[PDB]
Amino acid sequence: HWGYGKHNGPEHWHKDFPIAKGERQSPVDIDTHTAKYDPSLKPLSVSYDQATSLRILNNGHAFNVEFDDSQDKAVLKGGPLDGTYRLIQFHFHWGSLDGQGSEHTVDKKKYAAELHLVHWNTKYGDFGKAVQQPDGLAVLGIFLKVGSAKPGLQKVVDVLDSIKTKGKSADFTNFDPRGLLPESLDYWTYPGSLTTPPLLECVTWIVLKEPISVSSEQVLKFRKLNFNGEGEPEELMVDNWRPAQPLKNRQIKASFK
Numbered sequence: 512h513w514g515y516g517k518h519n520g521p522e523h524w525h526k527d528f529p530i531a532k533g534e535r536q537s538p539v540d541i542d543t544h545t546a547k548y549d550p551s552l553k554p555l556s557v558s559y560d561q562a563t564s565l566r567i568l569n570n571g572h573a574f575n576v577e578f579d580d581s582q583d584k585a586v587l588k589g590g591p592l593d594g595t596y597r598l599i600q601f602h603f604h605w606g607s608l609d610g611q612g613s614e615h616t617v618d619k620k621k622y623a624a625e626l627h628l629v630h631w632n633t634k635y636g637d638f639g640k641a642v643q644q645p646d647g648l649a650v651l652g653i654f655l656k657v658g659s660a661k662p663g664l665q666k667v668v669d670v671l672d673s674i675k676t677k678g679k680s681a682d683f684t685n686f687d688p689r690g691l692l693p694e695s696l697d698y699w700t701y702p703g704s705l706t707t708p709p710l711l712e713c714v715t716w717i718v719l720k721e722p723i724s725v726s727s728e729q730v731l732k733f734r735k736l737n738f739n740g741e742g743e744p745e746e747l748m749v750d751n752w753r754p755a756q757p758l759k760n761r762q763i764k765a766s767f768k
């Protein structure tokens with residue numbers, strides 16, 4: 512199946528998923544000089560105070576922290592978005608070394624990792640229906656750079672030893688995703704896609720300008736996860752990022768002047 516190796520990685524995905532060569536694929540390079548302030552953007556509202564985390568899963572590609580999205584709790588509204596988008600899960604992409612790992616780039620600069628908070632548009636009723644719609648999803652992307660530790664990440668780091676291999680999960684209740692945000696909500700936005708198969712072109716991307724800082728020790732623990740299942744030869748879960756894709760007929764808008 513698809514992955515991030517030489518023989519099954521991003522350059523091969525198009526054979527099974529021909530939309531990989533589509534017109535609104537993600538991630539992209541964010542050219543900060545060409546990005547334009549958009550006065551039609553409304554204030555962005557990240558409303559995570561009632562979030563209910565449930566579980567953390569190693570899915571063989573990354574780890575997902577899953578939320579109870581059976582009702583409106585942690586949601587994203589405003590900015591470029593029409594209506595209410597419910598948080599379903601977050602996950603990260605990261606590198607084998609600190610100089611790469613992010614999916615989006617900023618003037619071609621690669622960050623050590625990237626956090627994706629995934630939300631679906633409640634007008635479509637369920638995630639599977641939302642991924643049949645052009646405006647079905649909103650992903651809030653946050654860059655990670657290595658410096659000081661992020662206290663609100665440590666609970667994630669410390670559970671990873673219990674989900675080392677593909678298919679393992681653990682209870683992960685009472686986790687507050689507000690502890691993963693930077694101070695500023697300045698952002699860039701554009702229309703794109705999922706960055707993994709099935710690569711569906713359903714996503715409004717909202718990429719925060721301000722990175723969060725995490726410590727070297729925190730990201731080193733990400734890199735101890737495994738792509739493989741239990742009992743199989745160890746393949747470290749590193750470099751689980753797709754490179755930047757052609758911008759094509761898109762513009763990146765900025766929330767800030």
Ligand SMILES: CCCCCc1ccc(S(N)(=O)=O)cc1
Pocket residue numbers: 627629642650704705706707708709711
């Ligand atoms: C429709 C099948 C499930 C899709 C799950 C998924 C995949 C990729 C992303 S990402 N990395 O763009 O944020 C988010 C969510």
Ligand SMILES: OC[C@H]1O[C@@H](O)[C@H](O)[C@@H](O)[C@@H]1O
Pocket residue numbers: 560561562563684685686687
């Ligand atoms: O436990 C994590 C978070 O869960 C939410 O449901 C609560 O409303 C928050 O106060 C709490 O920080």
Ligand SMILES: OC[C@H]1O[C@@H](O)[C@H](O)[C@@H](O)[C@@H]1O
Pocket residue numbers: 547762
């Ligand atoms: O025709 C002028 C318009 O061109 C578009 O490509 C830009 O997004 C707008 O900001 C601009 O007003």
Ligand SMILES: OC[C@H]1O[C@H](O)[C@H](O)[C@@H](O)[C@@H]1O
Pocket residue numbers: 666670682683684685686687
């Ligand atoms: O908040 C996420 C998790 O953090 C820590 O692992 C706690 O021990 C656990 O009870 C909780 O589920």
Ligand SMILES: [Zn+2]
Pocket residue numbers: 602603604627706
């Ligand atoms: Zn992602």
